[PDB]
Design a protein around this nucleic acid. Structure first.
Lengths: 69, 32, 275, 131
RNA sequence: UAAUACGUAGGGUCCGAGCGUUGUCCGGAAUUACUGGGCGUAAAGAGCUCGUAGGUGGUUUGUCGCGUUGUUCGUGAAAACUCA
RNA sequence: CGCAGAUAUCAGGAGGAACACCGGUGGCGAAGGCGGGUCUCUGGGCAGUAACUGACGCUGAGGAGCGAAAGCGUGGGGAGCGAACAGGAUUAGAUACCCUGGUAGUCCACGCCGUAAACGGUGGGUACUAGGUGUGGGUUUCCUUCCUUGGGAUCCGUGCCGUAGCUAACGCAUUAAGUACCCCGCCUGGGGAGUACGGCCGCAAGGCUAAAACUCAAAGGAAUUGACGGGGGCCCGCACAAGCGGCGGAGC
RNA sequence: AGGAGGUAAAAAUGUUCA
């Protein structure tokens, strides 16, 4: 389960992606508070899209920052 | 293909539309 | 909405009229109908003070409740929506559950059967009347009091509304239809929503007679008067006045608001022009 | 959609013969089977099987090539197409390739070449030229 | 200014009581392509769909015999064309 | 623009428009086109099952609808951008490029318009014809870690490469420009001209249909060789740069 | 090899057959 194949969210640690699980969404963020791409995460397009939507909802509810710095 | 074929039609159309803008009111007084 | 007449006559070519669609009753409530008589733009002296008035269709005054203070917690249902010639808006006949019948300004979105609430514990719905202390910011309101108990003065015409921007203390800031931002005591009451019959502005009255029915007498221009009558008067042939624009009493164009007024401190930003 | 399985059959044949395939499987029709029989008799193919598919029946044409992969067929050409049906009288039958070819003719004496049709004095619908 | 393209001479050639020109039609022209064309860039795919009329029609049994095909009769004037 | 306190910086407020990262040879859509989030309503597609009907299919003249952007109307809105416009600059001149501003417009609502390099410059449907390699969606299956975007088989897509074949060539090449069938649209030398006249549509702009006279003996497409480039790369030369000495000015 | 962006401002034209 390496970077080019790390879709843990499909293989193991298969967590229903939620806008509340900031402990999960922090790994799919940069220090600058930006979303990480598939090429770095390892996610399928479905899971990346769900993570992105999760992050945006979390940002709208202040569980994550827009422009962290 | 080449753009000369575009440019010929371009010039024809440009001159025609200039003529129309120039004769707009004459054409209206005549048609209408 | 609007019904555009067909051009069967030149007095009806581009004319339009309201499709009195949100109206439900042709007749008013007799108990709430006070009489009216025209004035002709004439005052106690019998002299024209406001020109361009008179003739006019006969009218009757529908007693509107601009002071909805005595029915707090006493709900009503909109029994009817009716035409009012005294105003551009339509008017909603409310039946209070205590048996009182009253008229209001007929906001947008309001229909028969809609339940109207009054007071601080009312829902923020069209037609509901509340204090601004209880209305939240960013809300669209109408029929606002300038003073507690003074009655609704602001945002009464058709299609118009006020935007409550904020409340800081005992003063609520209101963007008015003119764009003017001003402060008003939170104790002042406002009806939630925007006024109805917003289509009214888009009516083409088509012919002179129609405004003669509405009570607007003909407006004569000064440049065709004589100089004894108007500063712009005179001139062989047409003229643009022969001077800068003025009233018939020589007052020029410009701000006529009295300075040093009490309202100057409540007003935040006068309206804008040109932009 | 499909509009003439005869042309479909000729095209499967032509393309497989171009690609040097040895077999050609396709759907079955009695007419296509009779055509395949004519081609077998005139020596343009090796054999043809009629077998059962999942739903209906299939034709499996075992094509023919020489020792150096000489294509036993050099051409196929549908003639009586839908949209333009061509019919030949017994006199003005077509000579395919100056006679070295074979024109498939549908007649009430059955399916038979232009040679057989001129022999029997009949004509009909010209389905194909299969030189 | 050094013309086998003009004009003339010789000479040659094609025809021959004709020879040339003009006009008209067909051909060449597969250059409206049925036989017998094409459309990415040469002219040429409607901006895309829906859908009417129309055109077209998978496998199969039987029948009609309309198309189709065979044969025969009548007609298809004479002249023409063609063969003798 | 500021020095009347700008820029900058901090705080607060108003408002408009667009939605960074995710986000790409990626997905959806008939095309146009669609990117903040949520909710509501809604369309289409794909796979699998094979329960159903039983050729009901394909195309589609005309016709109808949809149809980027600009534009038009009415009514709102209008932060930024910005035709026009105005200055400034450059310039021989600059109705331009550049700068400073800035109106319509861009935005919303309802409607008109109905065009575009609306392009894959490639009509739709069907069947067949070597493979390889990516990637998207789904079904299954086999090593089995029985971890598992480990692989395979298959359906639908979307890309790159590459056969045969085709092509004037460029190139297309199972997403054909191949092999074939059905249907539609369109072409028939370049200009004139997609113009006029007429008609239709349209508020208008203009669009759609659509010629002729006259004129040329070409217009064109692809590719080759050169030349050229205020294209690129590499390298040279008193070519420049660094220096010395001159000419141009005097007389002869 | 692993990793921001850039600048050349403007500067026109070319009788003859060829």
């Amino acid at each position: 389960l390496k970077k080019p194949r790390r879709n843990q969210l499909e293989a193991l640690g298969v967590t229903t992606i939620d806008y509340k699980d900031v402990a999960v969404l922090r790994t799919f963020l940069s220090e600058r508070g930006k979303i990480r791409s598939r090429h770095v995460t390892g996610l399928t397009p479905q899971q990346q899209r769900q993570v992105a939507t999760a992050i945006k909802n979390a940002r709208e509810m202040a569980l994550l920052p827009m422009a962290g710095p | 293909g080449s753009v000369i074929k575009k440019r010929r039609k371009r010039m024809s159309k440009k001159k025609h539309r200039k003529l129309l803008r120039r004769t707009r009111v004459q054409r209206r007084k005549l048609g209408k | 909405g609007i019904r555009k007449y067909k051009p069967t006559t030149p007095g009806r070519r581009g004319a339009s009229v309201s499709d009195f669609a949100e109206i439900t009753r042709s007749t008013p409530e007799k108990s709430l109908v006070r009489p009216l008589h025209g004035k002709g733009g004439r005052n106690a002296h019998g002299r024209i003070t406001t020109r361009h008035k008179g003739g006019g269709h006969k009218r009757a005054y529908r007693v509107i409740d601009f002071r909805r203070h005595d029915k707090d917690g006493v709900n009503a249902k909109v029994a009817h929506i009716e035409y009012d010639p005294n105003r551009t808006a339509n008017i909603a006949l409310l039946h209070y559950l205590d048996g009182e019948k009253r008229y209001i300004i007929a906001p947008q979105g309001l229909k028969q059967g809609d339940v109207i609430e009054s007071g601080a514990n009312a829902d923020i719905k069209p037609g509901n009347n509340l204090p601004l202390r209880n209305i939240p910011a960013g809300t669209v309101i109408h029929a606002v009091e300038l003073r507690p108990g003074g009655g609704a003065k602001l945002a009464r015409s058709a299609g118009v509304s006020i935007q409550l921007l904020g409340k800081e203390g005992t003063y609520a800031a209101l963007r008015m239809p003119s764009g003017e931002i001003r402060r008003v005591d939170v104790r002042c009451r406002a009806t939630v929503g925007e006024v109805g019959n917003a289509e009214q502005s888009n009516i083409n009255w088509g012919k002179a007679g129609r405004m003669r029915w509405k009570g607007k007498r003909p407006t004569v221009r000064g440049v065709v008067m004589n100089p004894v009558d108007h500063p712009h008067g005179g001139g062989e042939g047409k003229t643009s006045g022969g001077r800068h624009p003025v009233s018939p009493w020589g007052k020029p164009e410009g701000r006529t608001r009295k300075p040093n007024k009490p309202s100057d401190k409540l007003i935040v930003r006068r309206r804008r022009t040109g932009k | 959609t499909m509009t003439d399985p005869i042309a479909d059959f000729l095209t499967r044949l032509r393309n497989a013969n171009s690609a040097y395939h040895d077999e050609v499987t396709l759907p079955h029709s009695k007419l296509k089977a009779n055509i395949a029989e004519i081609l077998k008799r005139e020596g343009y193919i090796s054999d043809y099987r009629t077998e059962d598919a999942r739903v209906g029946k299939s034709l499996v044409v075992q094509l023919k090539y020489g020792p150096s992969r000489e294509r036993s067929i050099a051409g196929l050409r549908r003639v009586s197409k839908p949209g333009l049906r061509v019919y030949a009288k017994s006199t003005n039958l077509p000579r395919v390739l100056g006679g070295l070819g074979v024109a498939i003719i549908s007649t009430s004496s059955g399916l038979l070449t232009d040679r057989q049709a001129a022999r029997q004095g009949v004509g009909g619908e010209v389905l194909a030229y299969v030189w």
